[PDB]
Amino acid sequence: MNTVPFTSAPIEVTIGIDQYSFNVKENQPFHGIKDIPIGHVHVIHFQHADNSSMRYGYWFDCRMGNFYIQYDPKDGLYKMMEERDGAKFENIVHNFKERQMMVSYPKIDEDDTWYNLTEFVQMDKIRKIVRKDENQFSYVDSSMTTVQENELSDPAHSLNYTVINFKSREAIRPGHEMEDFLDKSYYLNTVMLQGIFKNSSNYFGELQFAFLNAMFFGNYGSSLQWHAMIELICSSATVPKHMLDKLDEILYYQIKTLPEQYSDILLNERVWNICLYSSFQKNSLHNTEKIMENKYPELL
């Protein structure tokens, strides 16, 4: 179990860790988060009480270093920093735990929600989508645009997601125009899986990480990418059996975890109706279909 201590909490802010959150008052005595499960990536995120503009946050993996949070009153945000002095950190943490000024990552033991949402997400890949290699952790926020979006402005602040377009030469083989447009199996299996991602696990990892940035930061592009990747699978007639079953699981927990009043903005009607009712794989997403019907039948 690992710890992310906080220097202080000078401004009132709602703080999340993974799917949990709690309200911290201005100058409340709050000095960090303990018992963070090792073995997964995590995200710590922030929404100021005063300007709900800009949700922002940090992806990190405690295995990769000792990290802490400190408010910056010049740039006006809670910043993640790495501590290199090992004993300085343990001593800071132990003093804080002793005075019991830290909240506990509140994982119910029955609960595998986080693992299921982050099954395929690896800090190595996150850092290739969010480029900033002087840090071991990754900053994301509400307003960051993707490399694909910037095409159609500041690259240092881009989400370098996989470019995907259903009406591009990368997607459509010369002389198979109709075949490839109505069955994207070539694009999915040869171009993306074999070519770019190399295996399904990397593909699913990007997919999961896109959903999580959508949900936690309302990053519009992340929602577009998440939706697109799903659509490339559902619109493929030929998908490995093991991907289809895993996809049903992945989506099930994303739909399960979404706030019930955020469905209007983070979910695309066209994609879900197509994926669940009209596509090749309309019958291969039993769990996901079931939970979508009982929980969001308005959309369909």
């Binding site: 009406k167 591009s168 030469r169 459509i172 125009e177 109709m178 447009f181």
Partner: protein, 237 residues
């Protein structure tokens, strides 16, 4: 964007463009099988690709053999249309290639967009106008060349005959769409008007009779009456 009454004049500017109509590409006669069921039998069709400014018609004849052993023909037909329009553009010299292609049915948008990926500077646009190009097969010479073809074949026409020597493209497109609209609403009567006077003939290198300017005014009038008439007969007014 889309093409409508507000931007009607762009058709006749100097930017090369083509209308593509697919209605006559896949044509069937539905009939009864000996067992009482129903079957279709295809006949030849054509793609109707027209330069609204110069009047050049690229009549691509679609021979029934193209459908042999295929499924979902009404869907395939839009993709065959798009392949053939793309092949036509590719066949043309650079300075003859269109800058826009306007499809008359929105369902052709994605098929054409996808066949034209190699031409990103050619805008593919729909229209909100209800153009009568479906009636193209009421023109005897175009119908005849399609029904007689034994193989795929492209035939070139100027659908304005020699009219541009005397009128503008705008007037010539208006005359064409009025003639086509009349043929579509009542083909029998429309043809009667066009051939009533045995003294006015169709030159061997034309599609339409050789009317003087006064006679075309009279013809156009009679075509307008017919379109209003059939609208009363239809709706009773």
């Amino acid at each position: 964007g889309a093409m409508n009454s507000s931007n009607y004049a762009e058709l006749f500017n100097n930017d090369i463009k083509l209308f593509v109509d697919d209605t006559n590409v896949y044509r069937v006669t539905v009939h009864k099988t000996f067992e009482g069921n129903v079957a279709t039998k295809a006949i030849n069709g054509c793609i109707f690709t027209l330069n609204p400014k110069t009047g050049h018609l690229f009549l691509k004849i679609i021979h029934t053999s193209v459908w042999a052993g295929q499924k979902r023909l009404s869907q395939l037909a839009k993709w065959k249309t798009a392949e053939e329009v793309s092949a036509l553009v590719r066949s043309l010299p650079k300075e003859e290639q269109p800058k826009q292609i306007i499809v008359t049915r929105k369902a052709m948008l994605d098929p054409l967009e996808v066949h034209m990926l190699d031409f990103p500077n050619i805008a593919i646009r729909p229209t909100e106008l209800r153009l009568p190009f479906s009636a193209a097969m009421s023109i005897d010479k175009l119908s005849d060349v399609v029904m007689k073809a034994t193989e795929p074949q492209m035939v070139l026409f100027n659908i304005y005959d020699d009219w541009l020597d005397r009128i503008s493209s705008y007037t010539a497109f208006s005359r064409l769409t009025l003639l086509l609209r009349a043929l579509k609403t009542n083909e029998e009567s429309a043809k009667m008007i066009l051939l009533s006077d045995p003294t006015i003939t169709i030159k061997s290198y034309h599609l339409w009779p050789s009317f003087t300017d006064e006679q075309w005014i009279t013809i156009e009038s009679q075509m307008r009456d017919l379109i209003l008439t059939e609208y009363g007969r239809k709706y009773n007014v």
